[PDB]
Amino acid sequence: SGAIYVGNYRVVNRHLATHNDWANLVWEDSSRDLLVSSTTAQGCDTIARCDCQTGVYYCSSRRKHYPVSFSKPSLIFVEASEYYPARYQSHLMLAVGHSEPGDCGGILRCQHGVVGIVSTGGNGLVGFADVRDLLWLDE
Ligand SMILES: NC(=O)[C@H]1CCC(=O)N(c2ccccc2)C1
Ligand SMILES: [Zn+2]
């Protein structure tokens, strides 16, 4: 689990979105596993605006943060789960690391701010849904 809180927005994994997230929907993209809902309280997370390929992510199944090198956002084949059939997920970044289903929502951060959230895993890889291209989150 986990979310990003920036301005009047909440960013979550689309497959973990709640009834309240869907009742206050701003934007969702199934191909990216992202959903953004509106909030009444102001969030103070900072989104990174950069092309970093190194950062640190939180892994709840280890209660640890790990430093990782990750690929640039791209279209990557993702195995089927209970939430989606096997498909290409877009705007996904991969790194070598640990990720279980419950790790989704953990934040990946660089020196500039939040880069994305854990969205995929298995086979010793961890995949993060990028949020750096969503410039509107800042206004
Ligand atoms: N983005 C996705 O398609 C998610 C769907 C649900 C799910 O549990 N995914 C997953 C995450 C970590 C390890 C193993 C699988 C992938
Ligand atoms: Zn950066």
Side-chain angles (χ1 to χ4, degrees):
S1 60
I4 307 166
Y5 294 94
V6 50
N8 289 304
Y9 298 121
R10 168 169 137 103
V11 185
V12 292
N13 292 88
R14 188 189 186 273
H15 72 278
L16 302 180
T18 71
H19 303 302
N20 181 74
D21 286 319
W22 278 103
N24 293 283
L25 180 66
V26 170
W27 171 83
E28 54 84 24
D29 188 329
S30 179
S31 81
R32 293 177 71 149
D33 186 44
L34 286 180
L35 183 150
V36 176
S37 60
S38 60
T39 67
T40 44
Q42 187 96 355
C44 33
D45 286 334
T46 295
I47 309 298
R49 300 301 178 193
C50 68
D51 61 7
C52 288
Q53 285 184 256
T54 64
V56 175
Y57 81 104
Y58 181 65
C59 176
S60 68
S61 64
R62 294 284 183 268
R63 287 184 191 127
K64 276 185 169 76
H65 295 263
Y66 292 104
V68 284
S69 293
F70 51 91
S71 63
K72 295 186 172 180
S74 70
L75 251 192
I76 293 168
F77 198 74
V78 176
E79 293 300 298
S81 68
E82 66 188 301
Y83 296 112
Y84 304 104
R87 79 211 207 279
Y88 284 96
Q89 178 161 323
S90 64
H91 299 269
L92 186 67
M93 295 173 296
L94 293 183
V96 175
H98 188 67
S99 176
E100 293 179 37
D103 290 320
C104 288
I107 288 174
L108 170 65
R109 303 178 67 90
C110 68
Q111 52 176 144
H112 306 112
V114 172
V115 173
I117 52 169
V118 172
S119 178
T120 75
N123 284 340
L125 299 162
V126 50
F128 310 97
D130 185 51
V131 298
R132 297 177 291 186
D133 67 314
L134 299 177
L135 310 187
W136 54 265
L137 287 175
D138 287 332
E139 55 228 22

